[PDB]
Amino acid sequence: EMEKEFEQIDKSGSWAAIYQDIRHEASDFPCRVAKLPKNKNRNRYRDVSPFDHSRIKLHQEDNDYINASLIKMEEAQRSYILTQGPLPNTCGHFWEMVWEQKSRGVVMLNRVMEKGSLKCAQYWPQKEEKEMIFEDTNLKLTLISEDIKSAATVRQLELENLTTQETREILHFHYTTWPDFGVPESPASFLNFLFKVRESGSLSPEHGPVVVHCSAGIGRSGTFCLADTCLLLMDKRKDPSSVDIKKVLLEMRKFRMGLIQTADQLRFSYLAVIEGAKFI
Numbered sequence: 397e398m399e400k401e402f403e404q405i406d407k408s409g410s411w412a413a414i415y416q417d418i419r420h421e422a423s424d425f426p427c428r429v430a431k432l433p434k435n436k437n438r439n440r441y442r443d444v445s446p447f448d449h450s451r452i453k454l455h456q457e458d459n460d461y462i463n464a465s466l467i468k469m470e471e472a473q474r475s476y477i478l479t480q481g482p483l484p485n486t487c488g489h490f491w492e493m494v495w496e497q498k499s500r501g502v503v504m505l506n507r508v509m510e511k512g513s514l515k516c517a518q519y520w521p522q523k524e525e526k527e528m529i530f531e532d533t534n535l536k537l538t539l540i541s542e543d544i545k546s547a548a549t550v551r552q553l554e555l556e557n558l559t560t561q562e563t564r565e566i567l568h569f570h571y572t573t574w575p576d577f578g579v580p581e582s583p584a585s586f587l588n589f590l591f592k593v594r595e596s597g598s599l600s601p602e603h604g605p606v607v608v609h610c611s612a613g614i615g616r617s618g619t620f621c622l623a624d625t626c627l628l629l630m631d632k633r634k635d636p637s638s639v640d641i642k643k644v645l646l647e648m649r650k651f652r653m654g655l656i657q658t659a660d661q662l663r664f665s666y667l668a669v670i671e672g673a674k675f676i
């Protein structure tokens with residue numbers, strides 16, 4: 397059914413028109429805290445901000461702000477934290493959020509350098525013997541293991557609260573092969589990555605929400621969560637044909653602005669859900 401709709405949109409070439417309707421219908425909520433002058437250096441992009449009502453608050457007393465949003469999908473029973481690629485000054489905030497929200501997995505959909513410029517700080521250690529200390533938030537991060545593949549890379553990290561000496565194992569899932577221009581022609585490797593994150597148990601309700609990010613945390617990050625939620629809904633509803641990707645995306649945009657940044661990313665999201673449902 398969804399495939400029949402997909403081909404009809406492709407034949408008429410209505411992806412730009414459908415995507416523009418989504419932008420027009422999307423929720424508009426204030427981002428007052430994100431726009432405070434003291435938080436200018438905590439935002440990577442001036443036009444991408446978390447809504448006040450869904451923003452993740454740090455448990456510190458000075459400044460609790462981080463550019464991160466909690467997406468709670470009620471019917472699908474999944475929660476995600478969508479955030480920007482950390483800045484050199486917000487890497488300690490990032491791991492503070494991971495600790496306080498009790499996240500088990502971190503999903504990275506970008507490379508540190510894309511389009512010939514920096515898109516994300518090197519917020520995790522590349523070498524086991526060179527651990528990272530975040531002095532502002534009192535956390536230690538150690539690379540425990542790294543399993544590299546052609547399209548992705550899974551790392552085991554140890555995050556330590558230096559105040560209590562508690563340690564947690566964080567799984568870091570890095571998708572490294574998103575094309576420099578446009579979207580992938582096939583959703584196969586992106587779906588393989590999603591199924592790998594699922595298989596790890598990082599999305600389980602036993603854990604805090606998975607942290608998902610790209611550079612701005614709305615484009616590829618939106619595609620990841622949209623596909624995962626739609627696949628969940630198709631497996632849970634009695635009538636799996638009733639899953640409307642546009643409705644699900646609009647629901648997600650109640651929690652973070654701008655999810656899915658292009659009409660090509662919208663088409664790719666449909667493609668990933670259709671092909672992901674066939675494999676499931």
Ligand SMILES: [Cl-]
Nearest residue numbers: 506507508509
């Ligand atoms: Cl990278």
Ligand SMILES: [Cl-]
Nearest residue numbers: 509510511512
């Ligand atoms: Cl590059």
Ligand SMILES: [Cl-]
Nearest residue numbers: 483514516517
């Ligand atoms: Cl950076």
Ligand SMILES: [Cl-]
Nearest residue numbers: 610611612615
């Ligand atoms: Cl991005």
Ligand SMILES: [Cl-]
Nearest residue numbers: 638639640643
């Ligand atoms: Cl729906």
Ligand SMILES: [Cl-]
Nearest residue numbers: 419654655657
């Ligand atoms: Cl938008």
